[PDB]
Design goal:
The structure is a homodimer of 273-residue chains.
Chain A: H1 5-21, H2 40-48, E1 54-59, E2 65-69, H3 83-103, H4 105-108, H5 112-133, E3 135-136, E4 141-144, E5 147-151, H6 161-171, H7 176-187, H8 198-219, H9 228-256, H10 262-268
Bound molecules: ligand Y8B (2 copies).
């Protein structure tokens, strides 16, 4: 609508990249693992697992249904039973994220070193933003095509920052264009560890944020959307904080129960030695 | 109680064999398959599958639970999805049945040719009799330890002869001793195909039936148990008929979708050529 030509083409490129690289039905997610058929650090692991307490459902192509109810925490390794499957899901999402960045002209024009630093910095955030678009806030369920992930037991759930983020972001009822602009702004973060072209990346980020702000002003006159751009920017700031918290959760769990795939090791800085 | 010494020792041997060879909790049933993640003969296959329309539940050692809801009949091969797992279950039960016969002195004293003919004749019947002792008639569920098999959809279910048999036999509220005597009588059937020692087997059967009849008269005075011995004998006659019906169902399904394990092939006469 009422944007500059540069702004409209910028949204069209982002929407084009999202359409090409986001398997919204998860049809190509296959071959994943499923759950099978000194102690002050350990209770920290119970805390480090809170955002992933889900049951799992598989609807088969034939119409069959498999449900998995996880074990209760009985003090043993059984809290790790879903981690292999989660690693396969996240890895699959991360490939989508990487493909998304590679399609964007503004991203492929950066030096490959900064491309790698930016993806290392933002992969978790873009993953969570994509998961929010399949999140059902009425049933607390991420609806991933034939897979469903439903939160286990009520409002003590919203004490987990990750889960409060998904419910709050869902409440804003964003358009597809606003989600993919959130992804652009998070991807082009000039202050990630190891970025060299600080100013180029920072100017790109500002252009994406200006586009987002202008999109909202032109297509959202309603008083419910007053300050909407500022709410989004505050959520992106919270999400970067959640990203730092969860990066540390992963490294702690990896330290005592290895599970990260090779791609997760690259993205989160695990060298293998 | 009030039986001869020969009769009491006969029950003690049968109970001893049952105790040694019947894994009532199914703890040693492992490594089984699970469902994955010209046309007048085909609708006969829908009929030939009626007694096995169950959903499946696995309680894990860790406290996790897996449930499988089968597909709806949509005209394709998806009605066969549970057959590999059923073959593994039946094979496992059949090994129990074979071990049971081998412990019994009266059985190991027959010529090995008649042993084989008797087991070929009775394996399905002894399997169904053992399954009845874990059948829950209130929920229509065979409760096999950590596995559960629950009948899919009400009283149209009791039109299936197998399922009417399990409900009716459960209603008689038999003791363990009466079940294992039912197994003896069915095992020692003088008129199975290929039995040579007709009279020896027939006299053994009569002794088992006399023992059963005397056990009921001595330990069951209540009017609800009037004619109980005759009800049991009528059920064993019905079960032999169900056995012949289901032997033909298996051979028909095997003919167009092979699934029988090697042990099932031996027991049901499939040569492999
Ligand atoms: C310990 C640990 C730390 C990290 C940091 C990760 S992860 O980035 O590789 N992926 C990831 C993916 C989804 C998540 C999530 C983390 N937390 C909450 N959901 C929400 C949800 C849950 C189920 C399905 C869909 C979405 C993993 C995998 C493990
Ligand atoms: C086509 C076909 C024909 C035959 C003849 C068999 S089977 O004898 O090898 N075993 C078998 C075992 C149990 C059954 C059952 C048959 N029918 C009803 N239940 C009841 C039940 C169902 C689930 C769990 C426990 C008990 C098989 C396997 C397939």
């Amino acid at each position: 609508q009422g944007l500059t030509e540069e702004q409209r083409m910028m949204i069209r490129e982002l929407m084009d990249a999202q359409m090409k690289t986001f398997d919204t039905t998860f049809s190509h997610f296959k071959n994943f693992r499923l759950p099978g058929v000194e102690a002050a650090k350990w209770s920290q692991v119970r805390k480090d697992l809170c955002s992933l307490k889900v049951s799992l459902q598989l609807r088969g192509e034939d119409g069959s249904v498999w449900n998995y109810k996880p074990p209760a925490d009985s003090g043993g390794k059984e809290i790790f039973s879903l981690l292999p499957h989660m690693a396969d899901m996240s890895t699959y999402m991360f490939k989508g994220i990487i493909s998304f960045a590679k399609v964007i002209s503004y991203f492929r024009d950066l030096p490959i070193e900064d491309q790698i630093s930016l993806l290392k910095g933002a992969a978790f955030e873009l993953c969570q933003l994509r998961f929010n678009t399949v999140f059902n806030a009425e049933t607390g369920t991420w609806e991933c095509g034939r897979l469903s992930y439903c939160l286990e037991d009520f409002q003590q759930l919203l004490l987990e920052p990750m889960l409060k983020f998904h419910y709050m972001l869902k409440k804003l009822q964003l358009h597809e264009e606003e989600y993919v602009l959130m992804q652009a702004i998070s991807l082009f973060s000039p202050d990630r560890p190891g970025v060299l072209q600080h100013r180029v990346v920072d100017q790109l980020q500002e252009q994406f944020a200006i586009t987002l702000k202008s999109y909202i002003e032109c297509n959202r006159p309603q008083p419910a959307h007053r300050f909407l751009f500022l709410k989004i920017m505050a959520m992106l700031t919270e999400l970067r904080s959640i990203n730092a918290q969860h990066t540390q959760r992963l490294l702690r769990i990896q330290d005592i129960h290895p599970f990260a795939t090779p791609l997760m090791q690259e993205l989160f800085g695990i060298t293998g030695s």
